[PDB]
Amino acid sequence: DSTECSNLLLQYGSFCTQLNRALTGIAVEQDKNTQEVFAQVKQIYKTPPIKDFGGFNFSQILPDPSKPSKRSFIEDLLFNKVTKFNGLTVLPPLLTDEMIAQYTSALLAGTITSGWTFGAGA
Amino acid sequence: TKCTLKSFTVEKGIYQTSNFRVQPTESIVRFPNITNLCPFGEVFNATRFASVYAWNRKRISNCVADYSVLYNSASFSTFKCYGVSPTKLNDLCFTNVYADSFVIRGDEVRQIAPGQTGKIADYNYKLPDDFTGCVIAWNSNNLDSKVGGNYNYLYRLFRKSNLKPFERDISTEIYQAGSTPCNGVEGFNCYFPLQSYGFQPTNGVGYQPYRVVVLSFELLHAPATVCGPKKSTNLVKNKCVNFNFNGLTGTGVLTESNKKFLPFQQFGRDIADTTDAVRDPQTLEILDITPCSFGGVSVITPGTNTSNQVAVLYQGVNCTEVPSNVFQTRAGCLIGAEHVNNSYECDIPIGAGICASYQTSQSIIA
Amino acid sequence: QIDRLITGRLQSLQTYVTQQLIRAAEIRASANLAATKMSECVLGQSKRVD
Amino acid sequence: QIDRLITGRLQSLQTYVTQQLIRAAEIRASANLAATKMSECVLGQSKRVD
Amino acid sequence: QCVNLTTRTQLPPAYTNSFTRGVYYPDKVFRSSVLHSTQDLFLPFFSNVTWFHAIHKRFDNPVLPFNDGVYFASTEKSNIIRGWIFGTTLDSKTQSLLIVNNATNVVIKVCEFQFCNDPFLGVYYHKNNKSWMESEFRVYSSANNCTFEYVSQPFLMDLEGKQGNFKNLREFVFKNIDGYFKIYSKHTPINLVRDLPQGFSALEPLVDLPIGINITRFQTLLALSSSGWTAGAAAYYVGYLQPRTFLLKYNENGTITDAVDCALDPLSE
Numbered sequence A: 001d002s003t004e005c006s007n008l009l010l011q012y013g014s015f016c017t018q019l020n021r022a023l024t025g026i027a028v029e030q031d032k033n034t035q036e037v038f039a040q041v042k043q044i045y046k047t048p049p050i051k052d053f054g055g056f057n058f059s060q061i062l063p064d065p066s067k068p069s070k071r072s073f074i075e076d077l078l079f080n081k082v083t084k085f086n087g088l089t090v091l092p093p094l095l096t097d098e099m100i101a102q103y104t105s106a107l108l109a110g111t112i113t114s115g116w117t118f119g120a121g122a
Numbered sequence B: 001t002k003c004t005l006k007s008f009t010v011e012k013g014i015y016q017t018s019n020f021r022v023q024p025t026e027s028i029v030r031f032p033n034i035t036n037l038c039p040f041g042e043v044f045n046a047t048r049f050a051s052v053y054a055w056n057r058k059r060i061s062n063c064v065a066d067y068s069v070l071y072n073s074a075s076f077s078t079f080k081c082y083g084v085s086p087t088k089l090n091d092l093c094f095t096n097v098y099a100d101s102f103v104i105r106g107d108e109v110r111q112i113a114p115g116q117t118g119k120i121a122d123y124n125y126k127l128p129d130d131f132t133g134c135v136i137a138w139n140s141n142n143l144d145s146k147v148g149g150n151y152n153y154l155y156r157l158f159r160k161s162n163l164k165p166f167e168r169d170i171s172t173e174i175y176q177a178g179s180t181p182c183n184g185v186e187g188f189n190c191y192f193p194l195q196s197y198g199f200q201p202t203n204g205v206g207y208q209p210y211r212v213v214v215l216s217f218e219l220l221h222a223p224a225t226v227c228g229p230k231k232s233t234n235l236v237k238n239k240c241v242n243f244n245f246n247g248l249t250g251t252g253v254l255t256e257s258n259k260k261f262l263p264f265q266q267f268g269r270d271i272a273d274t275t276d277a278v279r280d281p282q283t284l285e286i287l288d289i290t291p292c293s294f295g296g297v298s299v300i301t302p303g304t305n306t307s308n309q310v311a312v313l314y315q316g317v318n319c320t321e322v323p324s325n326v327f328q329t330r331a332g333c334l335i336g337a338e339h340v341n342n343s344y345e346c347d348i349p350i351g352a353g354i355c356a357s358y359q360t361s362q363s364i365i366a
Numbered sequence C, D: 001q002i003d004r005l006i007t008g009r010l011q012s013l014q015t016y017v018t019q020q021l022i023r024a025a026e027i028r029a030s031a032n033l034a035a036t037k038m039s040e041c042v043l044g045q046s047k048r049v050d
Numbered sequence E: 001q002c003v004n005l006t007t008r009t010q011l012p013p014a015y016t017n018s019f020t021r022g023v024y025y026p027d028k029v030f031r032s033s034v035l036h037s038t039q040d041l042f043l044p045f046f047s048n049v050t051w052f053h054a055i056h057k058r059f060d061n062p063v064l065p066f067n068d069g070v071y072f073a074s075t076e077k078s079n080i081i082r083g084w085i086f087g088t089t090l091d092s093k094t095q096s097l098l099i100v101n102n103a104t105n106v107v108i109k110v111c112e113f114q115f116c117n118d119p120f121l122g123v124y125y126h127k128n129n130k131s132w133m134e135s136e137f138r139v140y141s142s143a144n145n146c147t148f149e150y151v152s153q154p155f156l157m158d159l160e161g162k163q164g165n166f167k168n169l170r171e172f173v174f175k176n177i178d179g180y181f182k183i184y185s186k187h188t189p190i191n192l193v194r195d196l197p198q199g200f201s202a203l204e205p206l207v208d209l210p211i212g213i214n215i216t217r218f219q220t221l222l223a224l225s226s227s228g229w230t231a232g233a234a235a236y237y238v239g240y241l242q243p244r245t246f247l248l249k250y251n252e253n254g255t256i257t258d259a260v261d262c263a264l265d266p267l268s269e
């Protein structure tokens, strides 16, 4: 909120634009990495209602419909253990926690019901 | 977007063209109450006044001199200042002010000025060349005069040498006119230099009594004790305005706060040393100062070869502070896109799980 | 004085941007490693030791 | 004149710290590669070519 | 008046330790749940302070230096410790600060007072009324120049009391920064006999007197023809301030709870 300061700053050059471009590239590559890590299959798989997985009990890593969020018990434990000023703007990520949980559940259901064939093809 | 990308063929995507910021609307300035102005309410209209050779020197204590009540008062005869403008008196501070009040004849008022010389201005009271202050005189013939002439107003007339500025004489020895040493009695070469003027209610201009005061403005290595009356405007509850709470400065939107301060704390700061809460000095209420809405203006638009309709996104800005459907998202206010309840593949990433696309009668959807 | 303040704050911003770029490079390396581990261990059976 | 020296030496220290951070990132990548090669060639047998 | 008391018992100057005292608010800034680091004149933790204890006999109140501020604490009972003296020469040649708190009001005046050898305040006892009444004001004798004057509101406090141990604690901090004579104060109920309490208590500002004079030494004023008297059992402490860094912890309501001296021990560092 100054006038003469901006007039004296505009004479330095393209430092403003360079820093803005660097921060924008960082913000874009963050979402790029988030998509490259989780979003690997373009098909959201769902586990069947029967939990007869050969004796194994995947009732602590799969989503629970009774909870308001679609995260599992371990995911809730992980989220619980971790807790617009003058020129500071925090941009929200593209893929929210709900979409990340959906991708994780899809990968888990694929690994359970298809082994490794869901990655190489159908 | 065309000027930012420096081209005429804008491709499909979201581009950050410019930035948005809510400009302030007012410049409110507040200060505590102005109570206990100064002893000027009684030092000017007092009953008795000292003589010209024994003028009093009342030191002004810690009080804000209200010069507006004196300059705008038409009851006074003359109002002149030296070294400082009368209008800027209420906007400055001083360390010590001495008010010298006395009774002088109407014709001798002209000689009471810096740089003057004569009989009264050199043997009773003298002002320096660099005197900085004001002079105030007013007519008092309606109450200081009496039938038959008054003789209680003594004055010194003859002296052996000139007096220094801001000097008061106490000794009242007789004046020596000749070379013969005076033995304390009058004679051909020894006369009493102290006399008394006569003020009558039937005397015209030049013989009427005029009460003149001398205000001395001096500053040295000491904290200021007398300043001007600081004004206070009316505050606004919720509006992006400029604030000045007793020397502070900034721009933000105020709001009712719940932080219970301490009786001696004035303004609060959060982590990283930033002022986030101040106290109104008048009503003694606590109100936070959040920064005004600001963000980036992103223009969501498809390829130029497809269409020219665009969509504006204000990142981190509420839709109420923006001022053709207006839809509010968790990433910012989006103007120019129709929000649908269906789900499609993300074409133009916006943020917070929302994307835009140019589909179906035909407009940008979110 | 305004020029001195502008120079100091611009140097601070440049230092912050450099630190953020280095940290973002580290985070990108970690994310590439995590994506590789995902694609190998989760979507298959990696014979790579440790 | 002392302020000029302070500014120059501060710029020199900033440049040195930036170069050291970049070299430390390079050496961290090299050390991660070395640890991976250790775990995959010494503690086992890797079928990865070259 | 001007009386040179001589009937006093000679005792060596006692010493004690101030564990955690002199922690005052460096500014008027509110802070909630944040450990702020400030660098100003504070009292060093676990420092050697001088102890003046009046016995019965023992009425020690000499001229003490005043450099970079002085922390004044007095475990007082029956309203003995009333006022203080401030100045640079104390011989009516230069300006000096006078602070007196008698049974009516806290009178503060800045003139060129002429202080005598042993200035004090005398209070009668059991004058056919069963009530302590003050009748002596032997502090100064003249005042030619004056620059500031303050007369607080009149009030009535008790002047009697006889307990086996002290009940009130009065801590003060006096500084002179750019002519402003800052005054901090805090009171807390204690139950001790001859020891300084071992606890933490924040010191809040009370008044700022812009005297604009340079103070070099100070002196206290205790409560009581020229010989023969009985002084009340009371003691006061004096501690000098030094420029040291302290880490202050503010609670949710904006009050200091504990402090750490930055240069006291490796753990504190």
Ligand SMILES: *[C@@H]1O[C@H](CO)[C@@H](O[C@@H]2O[C@H](CO)[C@@H](O[C@@H]3O[C@H](CO)[C@@H](O)[C@H](O)[C@@H]3O)[C@H](O)[C@H]2NC(C)=O)[C@H](O)[C@H]1NC(C)=O
Residues within 6 Å of the ligand: A057, A058, A059, A060
């Ligand atoms: C797969 O693992 C989950 C998680 O351990 C198992 O759920 C847990 O089952 C036990 C055994 O019944 C529950 O303990 C008891 O449950 C009864 C209700 O049946 C409750 O009244 C008792 O107070 C006690 O808690 C446990 O609560 C339950 N935990 C959860 C989070 O549901 C599940 O049974 C396992 N599946 C199989 C097939 O073993």
Ligand SMILES: *[C@@H]1O[C@H](CO)[C@@H](O[C@@H]2O[C@H](CO)[C@@H](O)[C@H](O)[C@H]2NC(C)=O)[C@H](O)[C@H]1NC(C)=O
Residues within 6 Å of the ligand: B032, B033, B281, B282, B283
């Ligand atoms: C400054 O003056 C205002 C009024 O001009 C005072 O506000 C009043 O305060 C009294 C006491 O609490 C209330 O009973 C009135 O209702 C208030 N009036 C208004 C219009 O607000 C204010 O208290 C004064 N402040 C100081 C520090 O003296």
Ligand SMILES: *[C@@H]1O[C@H](CO)[C@@H](O[C@@H]2O[C@H](CO)[C@@H](O)[C@H](O)[C@H]2NC(C)=O)[C@H](O)[C@H]1NC(C)=O
Residues within 6 Å of the ligand: E002, E003, E004, E117
């Ligand atoms: C109390 O003692 C002081 C100090 O001895 C006395 O002050 C002296 O007074 C004499 C006579 O006026 C002077 O010649 C000395 O120069 C003074 N000394 C100092 C250090 O000031 C004072 O007079 C004594 N008061 C009484 C009542 O006996």
Ligand SMILES: *[C@@H]1O[C@H](CO)[C@@H](O[C@@H]2O[C@H](CO)[C@@H](O)[C@H](O)[C@H]2NC(C)=O)[C@H](O)[C@H]1NC(C)=O
Residues within 6 Å of the ligand: E102, E103, E104, E105, E107, E134, E151
């Ligand atoms: C405490 O001190 C104050 C001021 O030194 C005394 O107030 C004076 O009292 C006398 C006697 O009534 C008056 O003539 C003065 O005008 C008062 N001065 C002021 C400034 O008000 C007060 O009497 C003292 N109280 C006691 C108990 O000694």
Ligand SMILES: *[C@@H]1O[C@H](CO)[C@@H](O)[C@H](O)[C@H]1NC(C)=O
Residues within 6 Å of the ligand: B040, B041, B042, B044, B045, B069
């Ligand atoms: C005396 O003068 C002051 C200003 O100089 C004024 O405020 C006050 O009202 C006057 N007194 C009377 C009784 O008019």
Ligand SMILES: *[C@@H]1O[C@H](CO)[C@@H](O)[C@H](O)[C@H]1NC(C)=O
Residues within 6 Å of the ligand: B318, B319, B320
């Ligand atoms: C925008 O302002 C409205 C009105 O105060 C409020 O209800 C809404 O929650 C605000 N939106 C955000 C994102 O803060």
Ligand SMILES: *[C@@H]1O[C@H](CO)[C@@H](O)[C@H](O)[C@H]1NC(C)=O
Residues within 6 Å of the ligand: B339, B340, B341
């Ligand atoms: C989406 O659903 C909400 C909730 O009923 C409704 O108000 C809104 O009109 C719907 N929008 C569309 C485009 O169908």
Ligand SMILES: *[C@@H]1O[C@H](CO)[C@@H](O)[C@H](O)[C@H]1NC(C)=O
Residues within 6 Å of the ligand: E015, E016, E017, E047, E048
């Ligand atoms: C304080 O200093 C005195 C004087 O040497 C000494 O006798 C005493 O033991 C010291 N006290 C502490 C706690 O250091």
Ligand SMILES: *[C@@H]1O[C@H](CO)[C@@H](O)[C@H](O)[C@H]1NC(C)=O
Residues within 6 Å of the ligand: E127, E128, E129
């Ligand atoms: C006792 O109190 C009364 C009333 O104030 C007073 O007149 C009298 O002088 C006091 N006694 C003495 C000895 O002063």
Ligand SMILES: *[C@@H]1O[C@H](CO)[C@@H](O)[C@H](O)[C@H]1NC(C)=O
Residues within 6 Å of the ligand: E093, E144, E145
């Ligand atoms: C009192 O103050 C005046 C003006 O500051 C000065 O001229 C005078 O010498 C002072 N008196 C004494 C005794 O110092």
Ligand SMILES: *[C@@H]1O[C@H](CO)[C@@H](O)[C@H](O)[C@H]1NC(C)=O
Residues within 6 Å of the ligand: E088, E094, E213, E214, E215
């Ligand atoms: C300031 O303090 C010094 C002592 O350091 C003293 O001699 C002097 O009189 C004081 N006042 C002024 C105006 O220097």
Ligand SMILES: *[C@@H]1O[C@H](CO)[C@@H](O)[C@H](O)[C@H]1NC(C)=O
Residues within 6 Å of the ligand: E251, E252, E253
């Ligand atoms: C702050 O004040 C409130 C209200 O007086 C009180 O309930 C609360 O306990 C206080 N906080 C602390 C930490 O004591």
